[PDB]
Amino acid sequence: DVGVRKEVDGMGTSEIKYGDSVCYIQHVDTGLWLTYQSVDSIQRKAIMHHEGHMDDGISLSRSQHEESRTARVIRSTVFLFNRFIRGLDA
Amino acid sequence: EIQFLRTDDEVVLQCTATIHKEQQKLCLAAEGFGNRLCFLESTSNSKNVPPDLSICTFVLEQSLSVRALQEMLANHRTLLYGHAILLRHSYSGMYLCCLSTSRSSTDKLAF
Amino acid sequence: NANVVVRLLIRRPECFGPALRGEGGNGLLAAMEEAIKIAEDPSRDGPS
Amino acid sequence: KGEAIRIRSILRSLIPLGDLVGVISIAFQMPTIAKDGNVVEPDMSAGF
């Protein structure tokens, strides 16, 4: 529980690395760790545990700019077309 | 040592509005896909509603002089006051522009 | 001089009068018609 | 001259064409010959 360090105005220093680094996700307020329920398409339900499990590290894989843009376009078009369908139904 | 605004940097344009006797911060934003017109995203209520800075960020492409600009359309630099800047939308890849058309929201003189 | 005058006038849009100021100002035709009505209507044209 | 086109566009934005057409279409008040051959000419400094 190192806490929260001072806010730095700038690009900062490189700490968390894609692929190489291993990360554990912790809720800020409750402090619980995000783990797998290990219950039975893996479909392993994600829960919060006070202690967690032995293998909880998460690696990071950055998405390509094309894929990110496509995902956001998908979200926007889904929203707009749902609005259009609801208007036609109204 | 105060940092200086260079060209190849990602920034957001903010404006402060005092409406109904409340001082809150707004940021310029644009969807880009399916809606070219710009709008405002509130950033003051960050603790309650997350701002969408992805459609708010812009990148400075060029900061060349005004006479250089006239010459250009005739045929990591540091920003200086008076230059003509090019603002590329980070998400849509588009450029901020003064649209000729106007919504005509009782202004009749603004674009 | 024309460019400077136009720039100053558009910087100060109040120079165009009630009409042409926008923000609810009616058209120039409407302003002219209302001024004609004032001209042919006493008690609004002179002191009285 | 980009400045010239800019100034012309600004002036066009300020004054719509239809307003000018309507103001030009507005009619004057013709002087009237009345009984006894008397000319009644409305005061120029009071009207259109």
DSSP string, B31-93: --SS--SEEEEE-TTTTTS---GGGT-EEE-----HHHHHHHHH--PBP-TT----EEETTT-
C14 touches chain B (CB under 8 A): no
Q: How far apart are CA A83 and CA A78, in angstroms?
A: 8
For residue C3, report the phi and psi dihedrals to the nearest 5 degrees.
-60, -45
C29 closest CB neighbour out of D10, D11, D23: D23
* Continuous segment of H or E residues that includes residue B16: strand B14-19
Q: What is the DSSP letter of D36?
A: G
In this structure, are residues B79 and B6 in contact, taking their beta carbons and an 8 Å threshold?
A: yes
Determined by which method? cryo-EM
Q: How far apart are CA C29 and CA C22, in angstroms?
A: 14
D14 touches chain B (CB under 8 A): yes
Residue of B nearest to D6 (CA): B100
Burial of C33 (0-12, 13-18, 19+ CB in 10 A): middle
**Torsion of the alpha carbons at A45, A47, A51 and A53, rounded to the nearest 10:** 20
Q: Answer yes or no: do B91 and A72 touch at CB < 8 A.
A: yes
How is chain A split among helix, strand and coil, in percent rounded to 5?
30, 10, 60
Furthest CA-CA distance within chain B:
51
Nearest Cα to B34, choosing from A75, A37, A46, A5? Answer: A75
Collapsing DSSP states into helix, strand and coil, what is residue C3?
Answer: helix
Q: Which of residues 4-43 of B touch A (CB under 8 A)?
A: 31, 33-34
Nearest Cα to D2, choosing from C8, B87, B71? Answer: B71
- Subunits adjacent to chain A (3 or more Cβ pairs under 8 Å): B
Q: Which residues from D are below 8 Å from B73, CB to CB? A: 2
In this structure, are residues A44 and A38 in contact, taking their beta carbons and an 8 Å threshold?
A: yes
Q: How far apart are CA B35 and CA A83, in angstroms?
A: 15
Burial of B91 (0-12, 13-18, 19+ CB in 10 A): buried
**Torsion of the alpha carbons at C21, C25, C31 and C37, rounded to the nearest 10:** -140
Note the resolution in Å, 1 decimal. 3.0
In this structure, are residues B32 and B88 in contact, taking their beta carbons and an 8 Å threshold?
A: no
Sequence-distant (6+) residues with CB within 8 A of B39 are B29, B30
- Name beta bridge partners: B10: B59
Q: Which residues from C are below 8 Å from D42, CB to CB? A: none
Backbone Cα Rg of chain D? 20
C-beta atoms surrounding A62 within 10 Å: 9
Q: How far apart are CA B37 and CA B22, in angstroms?
A: 26
Q: Which residues of D touch C (CB under 8 A)?
A: 3, 7, 10-11, 14-16, 18-20, 22-23, 26, 46-48
Tokens (6 digits) for A12: 């900062």
Sequence-distant (6+) residues with CB within 8 A of C48 are C42
Angle between helices D2-14 and C2-11 (to 10 degrees): 40
Collapsing DSSP states into helix, strand and coil, what is residue D14?
Answer: helix
In this structure, are residues C4 and D11 in contact, taking their beta carbons and an 8 Å threshold?
A: no
- Name beta bridge partners: B58: B11, B89
Q: What is the DSSP letter of A83?
A: H
Angle made by CA atoms A66, B28, A63, in degrees to the nearest 5: 20
How is chain D split among helix, strand and coil, in percent rounded to 5?
60, 10, 30
Burial of D34 (0-12, 13-18, 19+ CB in 10 A): exposed
C39 closest CB neighbour out of D3, D19, D46: D46
